[PDB]
Amino acid sequence: QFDFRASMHMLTSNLTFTVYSDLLAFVSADTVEPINAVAFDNMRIMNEL
Amino acid sequence: QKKMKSIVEDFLKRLQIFDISRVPDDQMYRLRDRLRLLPVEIRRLDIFN
């Protein structure tokens, strides 16, 4: 049998939010001029210039 | 940021007997290394000083 007391619930959630997927789209990403690019040792990747 | 290949290319061109079109960049940079070890001529060195 349907019983109102056993069927009435309060459902809770957030009022509103926005889900995002492309996290890296929030990053501004530049690079140095390749002439000035350095390796792990902090010297230029190519040094013969 | 200055690539010195142009200097060696000018040097070889002014020697007048080589065809620079046949000279690779690696050879020009080896020439640059050998030139870099030489002292500067006295008048030019004093002017630069």
Side-chain angles (χ1 to χ4, degrees):
Chain A
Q1 322 207 19
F2 168 91
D3 179 36
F4 189 89
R5 278 165 189 86
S7 313
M8 208 289 316
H9 307 94
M10 291 309 290
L11 303 190
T12 301
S13 84
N14 285 276
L15 170 53
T16 185
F17 46 65
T18 297
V19 192
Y20 294 94
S21 292
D22 196 357
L23 303 201
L24 281 169
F26 288 101
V27 190
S28 276
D30 199 17
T31 196
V32 300
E33 304 301 72
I35 194 74
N36 301 316
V38 300
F40 73 106
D41 67 339
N42 305 338
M43 298 291 104
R44 265 176 296 190
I45 292 157
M46 310 187 104
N47 281 272
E48 278 297 314
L49 274 163
Chain B
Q1 315 185 298
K2 165 146 175 139
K3 299 181 188 283
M4 281 177 170
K5 185 177 79 174
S6 177
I7 293 152
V8 182
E9 182 245 357
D10 280 6
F11 163 71
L12 282 177
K13 280 188 297 199
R14 294 279 309 276
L15 296 182
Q16 287 149 305
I17 58 141
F18 310 101
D19 179 46
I20 54 155
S21 93
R22 291 310 202 181
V23 177
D25 314 48
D26 40 282
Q27 222 178 12
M28 285 191 196
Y29 276 102
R30 272 175 59 231
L31 285 168
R32 196 278 307 277
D33 306 335
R34 292 213 192 173
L35 287 154
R36 191 166 47 189
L37 295 171
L38 301 173
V40 178
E41 187 270 329
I42 181 57
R43 268 158 97 251
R44 294 172 180 83
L45 180 67
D46 289 337
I47 289 299
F48 191 63
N49 283 332

